[PDB]
Amino acid sequence: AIMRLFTPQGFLRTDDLAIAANFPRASRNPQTYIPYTNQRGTVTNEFASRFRTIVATLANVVNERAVQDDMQKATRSCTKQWLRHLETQFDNIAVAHT
């Protein structure tokens, strides 16, 4: 279930403007991979909301780990303040990526 978090959020785009340009391609169907989809006209970001549900798992892996080593509430809550700080910095820059 942790290795499900490494899956890409993209799509397999065909090279329509390369075949009509008759450019050299070393395969039958030239199908390059775009890392993430375009996100026009939406309130929420479907690429930045994938990262919301990854840290929702990763802030429970680090919470199940730190209570097993019975460490401080202060040393654990300050970690979880940073894991949702990646959320705020991901929601700002995923508008420019997608």
Binding site: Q81, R84, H85, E87, T88
Partner: protein, 48 residues
């Protein structure tokens, strides 16, 4: 302290007078850029 702002006498008198004024130009909100990330971000909801 980021939200609260110094109490200029000129605009507290404006906000009272806008309440019974006729609205001809459609009002619009100052663009509040907040995150609602930490549980300390209830200050924006108490502002509303």
């Amino acid at each position: 302290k980021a939200r609260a702002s110094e109490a200029d006498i000129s605009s507290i008198h404006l906000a009272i007078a806008r309440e019974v004024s006729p609205m001809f130009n459609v009002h619009e909100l100052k663009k509040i850029a907040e995150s609602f990330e930490d549980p300390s971000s209830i200050v924006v909801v108490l502002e509303f």
